[PDB]
Design an enzyme around this catalytic site. Structure first.
Site, PDB file in Angstrom:
ATOM      1  CD  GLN B  11      -1.962   1.376   3.052  1.00 46.34           C
ATOM      2  OE1 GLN B  11      -2.919   0.681   3.391  1.00 46.34           O
ATOM      3  NE2 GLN B  11      -1.324   2.177   3.893  1.00 46.34           N
ATOM      4  CD  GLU B  62      -7.989  -4.602   1.423  1.00 46.95           C
ATOM      5  OE1 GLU B  62      -8.701  -4.079   2.306  1.00 46.95           O
ATOM      6  OE2 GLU B  62      -8.037  -5.819   1.153  1.00 46.95           O
ATOM      7  N   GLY B 135       2.208  -6.981   4.671  1.00 43.82           N
ATOM      8  CA  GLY B 135       1.695  -8.138   3.972  1.00 43.82           C
ATOM      9  C   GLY B 135       2.221  -8.242   2.560  1.00 43.82           C
ATOM     10  CB  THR B 136       0.667  -7.316  -0.675  1.00 46.29           C
ATOM     11  OG1 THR B 136       0.990  -7.463  -2.059  1.00 46.29           O
ATOM     12  CG2 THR B 136       0.402  -5.869  -0.372  1.00 46.29           C
ATOM     13  CB  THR B 170       1.868   1.719  12.105  1.00 46.32           C
ATOM     14  OG1 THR B 170       2.640   1.334  10.965  1.00 46.32           O
ATOM     15  CG2 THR B 170       2.223   3.138  12.425  1.00 46.32           C
ATOM     16  CG  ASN B 197       7.524   5.309   7.753  1.00 47.87           C
ATOM     17  OD1 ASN B 197       7.317   4.149   8.106  1.00 47.87           O
ATOM     18  ND2 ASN B 197       7.351   5.718   6.504  1.00 47.87           N
ATOM     19  CD  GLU B 245      29.843   4.067 -14.584  1.00 45.57           C
ATOM     20  OE1 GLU B 245      30.442   4.256 -13.504  1.00 45.57           O
ATOM     21  OE2 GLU B 245      30.366   3.474 -15.554  1.00 45.57           O
TER      22      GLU B 245
HETATM   23  N1  LIG Z   1       6.495   6.184   3.166  1.00 47.19           N
HETATM   24  C1  LIG Z   1       5.261   5.735   3.367  1.00 47.19           C
HETATM   25  N2  LIG Z   1       5.049   4.662   4.200  1.00 47.19           N
HETATM   26  C2  LIG Z   1       3.796   4.203   4.410  1.00 47.19           C
HETATM   27  C3  LIG Z   1       2.713   4.796   3.791  1.00 47.19           C
HETATM   28  N3  LIG Z   1       1.602   4.134   4.179  1.00 47.19           N
HETATM   29  C4  LIG Z   1       1.960   3.139   5.022  1.00 47.19           C
HETATM   30  N4  LIG Z   1       3.317   3.176   5.169  1.00 47.19           N
HETATM   31  C5  LIG Z   1       4.149   2.288   5.985  1.00 47.19           C
HETATM   32  O1  LIG Z   1       3.941   0.941   5.633  1.00 47.19           O
HETATM   33  C6  LIG Z   1       4.234   0.140   6.752  1.00 47.19           C
HETATM   34  C7  LIG Z   1       3.414  -1.142   6.743  1.00 47.19           C
HETATM   35  O2  LIG Z   1       3.006  -1.514   5.444  1.00 47.19           O
HETATM   36  P1  LIG Z   1       1.459  -1.331   5.058  1.00 47.19           P
HETATM   37  O3  LIG Z   1       1.081   0.118   5.207  1.00 47.19           O
HETATM   38  O4  LIG Z   1       0.607  -2.192   5.953  1.00 47.19           O
HETATM   39  O5  LIG Z   1       1.292  -1.762   3.516  1.00 47.19           O
HETATM   40  P2  LIG Z   1       1.474  -3.262   2.968  1.00 47.19           P
HETATM   41  O6  LIG Z   1       2.915  -3.543   2.634  1.00 47.19           O
HETATM   42  O7  LIG Z   1       0.601  -3.434   1.758  1.00 47.19           O
HETATM   43  O8  LIG Z   1       0.922  -4.288   4.076  1.00 47.19           O
HETATM   44  P3  LIG Z   1      -0.563  -4.904   3.972  1.00 47.19           P
HETATM   45  O9  LIG Z   1      -1.548  -3.825   3.591  1.00 47.19           O
HETATM   46  O10 LIG Z   1      -0.967  -5.481   5.304  1.00 47.19           O
HETATM   47  O11 LIG Z   1      -0.566  -6.011   2.951  1.00 47.19           O
HETATM   48  C8  LIG Z   1       3.901   0.988   7.968  1.00 47.19           C
HETATM   49  O12 LIG Z   1       4.952   0.949   8.903  1.00 47.19           O
HETATM   50  C9  LIG Z   1       3.746   2.396   7.441  1.00 47.19           C
HETATM   51  O13 LIG Z   1       4.595   3.280   8.131  1.00 47.19           O
HETATM   52  C10 LIG Z   1       2.920   5.877   2.952  1.00 47.19           C
HETATM   53  O14 LIG Z   1       1.970   6.418   2.396  1.00 47.19           O
HETATM   54  N5  LIG Z   1       4.197   6.343   2.743  1.00 47.19           N
HETATM   55 MG   LIG Z   2      -1.220  -4.455   1.765  1.00 42.73          MG
END
Ligand SMILES: Nc1nc2c(ncn2[C@@H]2O[C@H](COP(=O)(O)OP(=O)(O)OP(=O)(O)O)[C@@H](O)[C@H]2O)c(=O)[nH]1
Ligand SMILES: [Mg+2]
EC number: 3.6.5.-
Lengths: 49, 428
Positions: B11, B62, B135-136, B170, B197, B245
């Site tokens: 996401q 998702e 997750g993904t 988170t 973050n 490079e």
């Molecule tokens: N830089 C950045 N990090 C984000 C953002 N949204 C979520 N994160 C980070 O993504 C981390 C976890 O991953 P998820 O947000 O759950 O996204 P995902 O990899 O698809 O995981 P799932 O949705 O459960 O499948 C968290 O620690 C958030 O800090 C964003 O918009 N920008």
């Molecule tokens: Mg996800």
């Protein structure tokens, strides 16, 4: 008759329809003395600042 | 010629693609429909009457976060099957992403990446964006590396991670998804930029002076990182650097490919016009050990290589003067097998101004992609969480339930253990 009065040549002479359009022809980038023609060119590269 | 394909998964991948492909759209002049009112070739294409389709895959199990770009203004910009979605989220489960529900969406992702590579006349890299905390992004993202490394072998695969922060998570099963997904970014990844973050929160707090920033503001600065990274692939400059490079004059012995980012003309309009943001001051703020985009202090690590990307009205005489003053300071130290440790690259294009966002108009930029042995601590902090959880076999029934054997937990920790052992070995 369809022949001429003294020359016996067909005077009607018709016009059969071109079955295709016989179109989209040719003309090539080649221009007479075998070089290339002057179409507008391109740049295809990174921006020239 | 000169094409790069970005591969967003997770996401955070979609949201970081909403800012990055935005910036690429302005930086060549594409309107929100896809029409300019050939520097653009790395990111966009030419589809007849001025149409400009981006070279991306937005991949998620998702549908919710990929639907907001499908229902916003940019359904008409992105090709509508370049936004591959799914039905059920992997749900913070590396097992679900990598073995169970990622193996049905992986077909459409590889088919579309293949179609996006067949219209290329020389492709430089795969700029994969992901977030190893869930997750993904941990699962299907890992499996996509397994498929990419076997069909495109010679191809380089850059990877912008979003590695877990020390005190901000988170997610509580996040230590499991981080440690188990090291092998994708150790043996099937040629450049591994480690971001988190909190370091963006701190930069936004003291430099941009937004006290309360959102994830959309975090995606501001990471967008500026790739613009300076692919700056030489698109606009002319005094010294140019391509992705071949970056992975040559920066990457040592092949397992060590873990770099850190530090952009540093970060300033906003209340400060900006009061100071000279010239080459000397922007590169001292670049090497400052609090502007790292990692929460990883370089003052206990050794700089093995650095890649300064100056970007604007930067003269090469000032670059060679700026690398002198950073080399004469004791607080910055280097490994002994490095007489020269800088790949300076200048792009003539000024930094793209930010109307209504967070940055200001600056005439010149700098971004560092530097590999150091300090990065042997971003994984040691996650060792302590992994060993604490796996001591009591916590949260592992969710993993073993979809077909993830209990064995892989041990040699994923052991693989990261050899990763740590490899890092103090270089610094002897
Ligand atoms: N830089 C950045 N990090 C984000 C953002 N949204 C979520 N994160 C980070 O993504 C981390 C976890 O991953 P998820 O947000 O759950 O996204 P995902 O990899 O698809 O995981 P799932 O949705 O459960 O499948 C968290 O620690 C958030 O800090 C964003 O918009 N920008
Ligand atoms: Mg996800």
């Amino acid at each position: 008759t369809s022949l001429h009065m003294s020359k016996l040549v067909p005077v009607t002479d018709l016009s059969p329809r071109p079955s295709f359009r016989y179109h989209a022809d040719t003309g090539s980038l080649d221009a007479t003395l075998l070089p290339v023609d002057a179409v507008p060119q391109e740049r295809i590269g990174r921006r020239l600042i | 010629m000169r094409e790069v394909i970005s591969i967003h998964v997770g996401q955070a991948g979609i949201q970081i693609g909403n800012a990055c492909w935005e910036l690429f759209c302005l930086e060549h002049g594409i309107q929100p429909d896809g029409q300019m009112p050939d520097a653009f070739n790395t990111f966009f294409s030419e589809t007849g009457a001025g149409k400009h389709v981006p070279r991306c895959v937005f991949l998620d199990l998702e549908p919710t976060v990929v639907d907001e770009v499908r229902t916003g203004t940019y359904r008409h910009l992105f090709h509508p099957e370049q936004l591959i979605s799914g039905k059920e989220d992997a749900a913070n489960n590396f097992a679900r992403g990598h073995y169970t529900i990622g193996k049905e969406i992986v077909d459409l992702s590889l088919d579309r990446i293949r179609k996006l590579a067949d219209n290329c006349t020389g492709l430089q890299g795969f700029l994969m964006f992901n977030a190893v905390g869930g997750g993904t992004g941990s699962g299907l993202g890992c499996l996509l590396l397994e498929r990419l490394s076997v069909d495109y072998g010679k191809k380089s695969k850059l990877n912008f991670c979003s590695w877990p922060s020390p005190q901000v998570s988170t997610a509580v099963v996040e230590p499991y998804n981080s440690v188990l997904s090291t092998h994708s970014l150790l043996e099937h990844t040629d450049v591994a930029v480690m971001l988190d973050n909190e370091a963006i929160y701190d930069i936004c707090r003291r430099n941009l002076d937004i006290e309360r920033p959102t994830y959309t503001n975090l995606n501001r600065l990471i967008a500026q990182v790739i613009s300076s990274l692919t700056a030489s692939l698109r606009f002319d400059g005094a010294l140019n650097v391509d992705v071949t490079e970056f992975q040559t004059n920066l990457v040592p012995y092949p397992r060590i490919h873990f770099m850190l980012s530090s952009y540093a003309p970060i300033i906003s309009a209340e400060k900006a016009y009061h100071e000279q943001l010239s080459v000397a001051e922007i590169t001292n703020s670049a090497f400052e050990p609090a502007s790292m985009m990692a929460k990883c202090d370089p003052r206990h690590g050794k700089y093995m290589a650095c890649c300064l990307m100056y970007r604007g009205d930067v003269v090469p005489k000032d670059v060679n003067a700026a690398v002198a003053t950073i080399k004469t300071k004791r607080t910055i130290q280097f490994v002994d097998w490095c007489p020269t440790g800088f790949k300076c690259g200048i792009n003539y294009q000024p930094p793209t101004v930010v109307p209504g966002g967070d940055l200001a108009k600056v005439m010149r930029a700098v971004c560092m992609i530097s590999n150091s042995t300090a990065i042997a601590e971003v994984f040691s902090r996650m060792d302590h969480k992994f060993d604490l959880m796996y001591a009591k076999r916590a949260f592992v029934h969710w993993y073993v339930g979809e077909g993830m054997e209990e064995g892989e937990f041990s040699e994923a920790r052991e693989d990261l253990a050899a990763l740590e052992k490899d890092y103090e070995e270089v610094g002897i």
